[PDB]
Amino acid sequence: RRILVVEDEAPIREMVCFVLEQNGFQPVEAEDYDSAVNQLNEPWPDLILLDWMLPGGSGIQFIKHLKRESMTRDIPVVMLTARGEEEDRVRGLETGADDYITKPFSPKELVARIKAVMRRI
Amino acid sequence: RRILVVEDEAPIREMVCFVLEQNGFQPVEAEDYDSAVNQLNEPWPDLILLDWMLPGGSGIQFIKHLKRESMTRDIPVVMLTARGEEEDRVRGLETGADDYITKPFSPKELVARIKAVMRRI
Ligand code: BEF
Ligand code: BEF
Ligand SMILES: [Mg+2]
Ligand SMILES: [Mg+2]
Numbered sequence: 001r002r003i004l005v006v007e008d009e010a011p012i013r014e015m016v017c018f019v020l021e022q023n024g025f026q027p028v029e030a031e032d033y034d035s036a037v038n039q040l041n042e043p044w045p046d047l048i049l050l051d052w053m054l055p056g057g058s059g060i061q062f063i064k065h066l067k068r069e070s071m072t073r074d075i076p077v078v079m080l081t082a083r084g085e086e087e088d089r090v091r092g093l094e095t096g097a098d099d100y101i102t103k104p105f106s107p108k109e110l111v112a113r114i115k116a117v118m119r120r121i
Numbered sequence: 122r123r124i125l126v127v128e129d130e131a132p133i134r135e136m137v138c139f140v141l142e143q144n145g146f147q148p149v150e151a152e153d154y155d156s157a158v159n160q161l162n163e164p165w166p167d168l169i170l171l172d173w174m175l176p177g178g179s180g181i182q183f184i185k186h187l188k189r190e191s192m193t194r195d196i197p198v199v200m201l202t203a204r205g206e207e208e209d210r211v212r213g214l215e216t217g218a219d220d221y222i223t224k225p226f227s228p229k230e231l232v233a234r235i236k237a238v239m240r241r242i
Contacts, residue, residue, distance in 0.1 A: 076241070086227045093233035098241055099220065106207045112214035120197070120219055120241040 001118060003027045004045040006036040006062070007080070008054050012103075016049070016080070019107045025114075033057035037065060045075060047114060052081035052092070063096045076117045080105065122239060124148045125166040127157040127183070128201070129175050133224075137170070137201070140228045146235075154178035158186060166196060168235060173202035173213070184217045197238045201226065 003025045007013040010031065017027040028045065030036035033056035040048070048066070050059040059079055066072045076098045081088075084102040092100040098117045101110060124146045128134040131152065138148040149166065151157035154177035161169070169187070171180040180200055187193045197219045202209075205223040213221040219238045222231060 086230060090227070090229045090233050093230070093237050096240075098237050099234075106211070108211045109207060109214070112211050113220075116214050116219050117241070119217075120238070 001025050001046040002043060003114070004030060004036065004039055004048040004050075006030040006048065006054065006059065007051040008032055009051075016110075019110065020049075020114075023111045031055075033062060036062055040066070040072065040075075047076045047078060047118060049114065050077050050079050050081075050097070052079060052083045052088070060091060060095050063092070067096045074121075076121060078114060078117055080110065122146050122167040123164060124235070125151060125157065125160055125169040125171075127151040127169065127175065127180065128172040129153055130172075137231075140231065141170075141235075144232045152176075154183060157183055161187070161193065161196075168197045168199060168239060170235065171198050171200050171202075171218070173200060173204045173209070181212060181216050184213070188217045195242075197242060199235060199238055201231065 003020050005013055005017055005027045008031050013029060020027045028039055030039045033054050052059040063077055078099040079092045079097045080101045082103040089100050099113050101113060124141050126134055126138055126148045129152050134150060141148045149160055151160045154175050173180040184198055199220040200213045200218045201222045203224040210221050220234050222234060
């Protein structure tokens with residue numbers, strides 16, 4: 001299963017890709033809004049793991065991009081972000097995120113939530 | 122959409138059913154393990170909102186019951202529980218929960234997660 005990992009802090013992104021590799025996934029990297037848009041293409045990701053605060057546009061705006069395009073609107077998105085306030089968790093979910101995980105995170109819970117979401121398609 | 126609400130603290134259960142009613146759902150109540158098993162029938166619930174610590178058996182065991190039976194294994198389950206330790210969140214998800222929410226909760230986030238899960242079927 002391919003996972004688009006969207007995260008601008010390169011050492012965190014690489015750590016996340018390692019956890020995912022070790023858990024059976026094939027991650028692909030995007031470091032900002034525009035890279036995520038461009039990287040979002042064939043071969044399609046099975047899921048998009050998405051930071052909120054990114055150069056060039058937020059992950060909220062990215063979900064709006066995904067959901068506006070009939071070709072991408074069914075691709076699951078799980079947010080993984082330092083924005084932990086209730087208002088933000090609700091905002092992410094309501095925009096279209098299938099789940100929303102806050103930093104710092106447990107690598108076991110991260111993988112468990114991704115696989116839970118993947119079970120639901 | 123029908124929601125089976127499994128929770129043994131009756132005033133919390135009733136509060137939860139109120140939030141769900143106000144948000145477009147048709148909740149049905151179960152106060153313990155055996156009631157949840159019995160209440161789990163036609164007309165099927167669209168989703169099961171499930172407390173962990175219940176008389177007669179845990180919500181973990183209930184998910185095992187659901188997943189063993191081909192007639193019920195695709196019904197989404199969201200846990201809502203005072204068991205907040207990382208180990209428990211992972212345990213719930215790995216058993217088959219589509220999401221896992223800890224008490225005390227935001228009624229906006231509760232509804233947002235239920236609808237996110239409902240979007241994924
Ligand atoms: F920049 Be992310 F929201 F942690
Ligand atoms: F009894 Be529940 F797990 F809050
Ligand atoms: Mg960031
Ligand atoms: Mg209980």
